[PDB]
Design a protein around this ligand. Structure first.
Ligand SMILES: NCCCCCC(=O)O
Ligand SMILES: [Mn+2]
Ligand SMILES: [Mn+2]
Ligand SMILES: [Zn+2]
Length: 476
């Protein structure tokens, strides 16, 4: 078969590195009238993205023609898959021509193809490195119009280019976007925000007086913790690295941060999403069986990730640590409810249940309506997550919750829900086990009614490392 031969020939070069031969085969396929498929086109694109940018003369044919092949694939109405956007993008990144990267995205839109976030990157970042703010905002406007949602890298780029070109409006809007989409910022973004607030442009923006009533209503309207009506106050900013105490009180300025509400409608939307995603990966009957059991049980004040509580900081499963966590959760329940323990069926049988009194207690929890053993082969993370969300209660787990399953849940609602519901254990030599409860305020960029800002840095584990904030408040 002709296209099967081209597949095989293109699989070979390049797993060999041979761009020249891939390009020869490309032009040959056209002279023979063999129509290239999706698979062929992807291999071509990947292979061309192995070519390098000529630090000495005219661009290399592999990069130049790489774009031309991309252009052709779309013209041919050949559907792009995830490999296409990835290869298309590394092509764009290798070339490092923001204008050409932008053309690729304009072409996808032309032909009704949804561009991906990685498609926009080389265009956005290209312009940003060259200080071309206007071009950067064009790419941004295009990305927004395509309903592609930026992440922290894209926003930090936009923030930097806005700072570089003294655009206080665009700084404000980007900072709002960071609040809305990212919440807590990386070290480098944090440093950049700090620079902004200390800068001459920031000193010189603002208003001496404003419609206090309009700010009030914007606070209500936004959900709390910001107003979005623009820079307030005048003069130099006092900008300090600081911390919040356990009550959300800024140690620098004594402002008490807001606890921002979660709309219960969003929670019901998320619960439905969860069921949909779980039933796509679990045996549907196993997940449904849990849902039905949960409907006949409760109420619960807490759900325990049993495997994580048995295992976190242990060389092997500790029934002690699970049992101590169960008792501590029951003690803080106002009515002393046992928590719902989610445990693998594999973990109820064998050991920790090696010791008969432990076995008998696990069965006691099950008979009290407070243990569900997840079937062999199931991913029990769907089960304790769905239980806590559905029962509207505390979730006791030290699971990071940023491994693949959890990337599926998104970066808007889930991180806000987690902050309000997640209980983590910590253990010391001196005191034993401690429950670390959700904070009584929201750990997010906040903008006060008088225009004062508090910006949280993102950390690995805020129990391990004490979270730094920026306090930015006008001097007079
Ligand atoms: N610290 C956790 C090690 C193994 C964890 C098992 C789990 O989290 O589901
Ligand atoms: Mn788990
Ligand atoms: Mn896990
Ligand atoms: Zn403060």
């Amino acid at each position: 078969s002709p296209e099967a031969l081209l597949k095989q020939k293109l699989d070979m070069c390049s797993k060999k590195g041979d761009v020249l031969e891939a390009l020869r085969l490309y032009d040959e396929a056209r002279r023979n009238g063999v129509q290239l498929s999706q698979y062929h086109y992807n291999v071509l694109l990947y292979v061309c993205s192995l070519a390098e940018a000529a630090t000495e003369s005219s661009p290399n044919p592999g990069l130049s023609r790489g774009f031309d092949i991309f252009k052709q694939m779309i013209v041919d109405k050949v559907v792009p898959n995830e490999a296409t956007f990835t290869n298309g993008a590394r092509l764009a990144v290798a070339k490092d021509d923001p204008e050409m990267a932008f053309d690729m995205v304009k072409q996808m839109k032309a032909f009704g193809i949804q561009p991906r976030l990685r498609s926009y990157g080389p265009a956005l970042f290209g312009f940003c490195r060259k200080g071309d703010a206007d071009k950067a905002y064009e790419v941004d406007a295009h990305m927004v119009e395509s309903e592609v949602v930026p992440e922290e890298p894209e926003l930090a780029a936009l923030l930097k280019v806005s700072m570089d070109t003294k655009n206080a409006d665009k700084v404000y809007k980007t900072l709002q976007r960071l609040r809305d989409l990212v919440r807590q910022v990386s070290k480098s973004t944090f440093d950049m925000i700090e620079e902004w607030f200390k800068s001459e442009v920031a000193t010189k923006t603002g208003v001496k007086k404003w419609d206090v009533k309009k700010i009030r209503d914007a606070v209500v309207s936004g959900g709390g913790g910001w107003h979005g009506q623009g820079w307030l106050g005048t003069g130099k900013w006092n900008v300090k690295r600081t911390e919040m105490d356990e009550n959300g009180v800024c140690k620098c300025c004594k402002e008490k941060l807001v606890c921002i509400d979660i709309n219960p409608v969003e929670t019901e939307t998320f619960a439905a999403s969860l069921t949909r995603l779980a039933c796509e990966r679990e045996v549907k009957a196993n997940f449904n069986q849990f849902q039905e059991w949960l409907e006949r049980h409760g109420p619960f004040d807490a759900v325990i990730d049993g495997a994580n509580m048995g295992l976190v900081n242990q060389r092997s499963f500790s029934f002690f640590q699970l049992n101590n966590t169960v008792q501590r959760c029951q003690q803080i329940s106002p009515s002393k409810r046992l928590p719902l323990v989610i445990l693998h069926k594999s973990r109820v049988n064998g050991g920790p249940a090696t010791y008969p009194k432990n076995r008998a207690l696990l069965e006691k929890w099950k008979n009290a309506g407070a243990l569900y053993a997840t079937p062999p082969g199931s991913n029990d993370d769907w089960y304790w997550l769905y239980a806590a969300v559905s029962c509207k209660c505390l979730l006791v787990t030290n699971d990071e919750m940023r491994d693949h399953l959890f990337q599926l849940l998104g970066n808007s609602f889930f991180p806000r829900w987690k902050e309000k519901h997640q209980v983590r254990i910590s253990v010391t030599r001196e005191d034993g086990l401690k429950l670390n409860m959700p904070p009584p305020y929201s750990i997010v960029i906040q903008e006060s009614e008088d225009g004062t800002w508090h910006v949280p840095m993102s950390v690995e584990d805020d129990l391990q490392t004490s979270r730094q904030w920026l306090c930015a408040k006008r001097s007079k």
